[PDB]
Amino acid sequence: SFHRVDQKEITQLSHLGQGTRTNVYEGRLRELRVVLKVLDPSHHDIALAFYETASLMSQVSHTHLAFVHGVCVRGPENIMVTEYVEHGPLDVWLRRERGHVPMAWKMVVAQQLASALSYLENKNLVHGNVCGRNILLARLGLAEGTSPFIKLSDPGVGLGALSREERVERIPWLAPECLPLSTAMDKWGFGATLLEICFDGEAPLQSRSPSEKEHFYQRQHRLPEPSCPQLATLTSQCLTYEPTQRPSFRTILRDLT
Amino acid sequence: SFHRVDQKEITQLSHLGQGTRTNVYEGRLRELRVVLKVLDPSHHDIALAFYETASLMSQVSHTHLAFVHGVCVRGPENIMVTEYVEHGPLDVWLRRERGHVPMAWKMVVAQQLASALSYLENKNLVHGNVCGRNILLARLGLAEGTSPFIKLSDPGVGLGALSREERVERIPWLAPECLPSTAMDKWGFGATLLEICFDGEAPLQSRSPSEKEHFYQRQHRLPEPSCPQLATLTSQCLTYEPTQRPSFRTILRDLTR
Ligand SMILES: CNC(=O)c1nnc(NC(=O)C2CC2)cc1Nc1cccc(-c2ncccn2)c1OC
Ligand SMILES: CNC(=O)c1nnc(NC(=O)C2CC2)cc1Nc1cccc(-c2ncccn2)c1OC
């Protein structure tokens, strides 16, 4: 379970984006600043998948995971009330500052992403949506002697409710076993996100057509090596088609530090 | 003197604000994150008050004073290359977080500002523009987190070069004797101490130039702070007799107890 929010406590403001089956808005919680994830009109299947995500996030506590205030369930409306994170999604930032993000900064982001993912591994919980967009910058770490500070977002509508078409869109982040749930899928996610971070918010296959994406996974191909050997080995280990072959986050965090 | 920065070394980024006769931009220095204070096309005396400010800031070193990198000369425009601090101006932050800033937080900021201002007093060096806006937050310190870490900015185009209209615009922070010495920063400190107490809202801010000037001409005194721990300190500071204002050595001593 998750905390219930009455429609009278939440105010909608600026549209920020569009998630899988959702529309992201800025909002107020009665007045604290929040983000409202408004689920589109849906079957009970999708509403339940949205609840599992709120629940996963509601029963966790880590310094590098966004907080969930609860869910507001009305007539045809489901709104996840979540933490507003100052500088927004990392992928957008990495594109804005393309060619000007040092290796040291990216490395911190990776340690923080893996610290957050080691905690869900030990509690045998699956995030299932690791990508640049779901990494939020609480602190930019642009000034000397200041490091970036991340906050991994809620995974949105759970993978179990998405269609093949929607799963194909999640490539290169989607684990190949997930194309047709284990914690090993977040190892593929962490891996494809390392690549996205190295290539300054430009993930491999991102421009490719759904068929070209689907074919790459069907033909069992592998993603490019990054432009920094500081992560080249770690990525090859994570981005293996064999789930059992992927390193544990305990191992990853060791391989980083 | 000060360092000469070529325009090849700098990169102008997003605009942050406007000062007296300047436009403030975020930027890069070849690679550090910097703040570029671009002076408007100016006459040799204005540019000299700008060069004098660069010089003051260049030839001083203090933990709680922002760093000046050098000066660039791009056609009619002069660029003061300064330090980028993580959270920017303090007034902006106090207004944003009004009614959520503990007295302790305000007292750490006060001492830190008195330290910077004592350093310059032992050096017999005036600032001339001590106001909330010229208080930069390197560490936010809410909550706890460790406590805040401010940096007093450069004062921009020196007072001496400004007009009556510009000097009036600096009320309530402008010392009354400066409307028609190191004593002026004691008023500036006092006026800022009110600004910090009233959560970034200074007295006379929203008033007309004639109302502001009239308040000073009629020798009218500013409000008492809602912070009782500062009532006497600011009363001693915000006096119309420069010689009746305490030294920063005294303010610091008093602040500890
Ligand atoms: C848990 N809190 C959050 O997720 C969240 N928090 N803060 C911000 N702040 C901001 O943006 C700041 C203004 C810059 C944005 C956030 N989410 C967000 C914004 C825009 C698009 C998406 C999206 N979601 C799924 C698919 C695609 N995009 C999205 O969710 C990740
Ligand atoms: C010496 N370095 C600086 O002054 C300075 N350094 N860092 C930040 N960081 C940021 O903001 C980053 C976004 C967090 C802001 C800074 N200055 C600043 C920002 C915006 C407006 C002004 C202005 N100056 C005079 C009058 C009115 N406004 C201004 O100068 C004080």
UniProtKB/Swiss-Prot annotation, chain A:
The Protein kinase domain, residue ranges: 10-257
GO biological process: cell differentiation; cell population proliferation; cell surface receptor signaling pathway via JAK-STAT; cellular response to virus; cytokine-mediated signaling pathway; growth hormone receptor signaling pathway via JAK-STAT; immune response; interleukin-10-mediated signaling pathway
Any GO CC annotation of this UniProt entry: interleukin-23 receptor complex
Repeat found in the keyword field: yes
Residue numbers of Phosphotyrosine PTMs: 25
Tissues in which the UniProt entry reports expression: Observed in all cell lines analyzed. Expressed in a variety of lymphoid and non-lymphoid cell lines.
Family designation: Belongs to the protein kinase superfamily. Tyr protein kinase family. JAK subfamily.
Role of this protein: Tyrosine kinase of the non-receptor type involved in numerous cytokines and interferons signaling, which regulates cell growth, development, cell migration, innate and adaptive immunity. Plays both structural and catalytic roles in numerous interleukins and interferons (IFN-alpha/beta) signaling. Associates with heterodimeric cytokine receptor complexes and activates STAT family members including STAT1, STAT3, STAT4 or STAT6.
Protein name per its UniProtKB record: Non-receptor tyrosine-protein kinase TYK2
Organism: Homo sapiens (Human)
Lineage of source species: Eukaryota, Metazoa, Chordata, Craniata, Vertebrata
Gene: TYK2
Shown segment, full-protein numbering: 580 to 867 of 1187
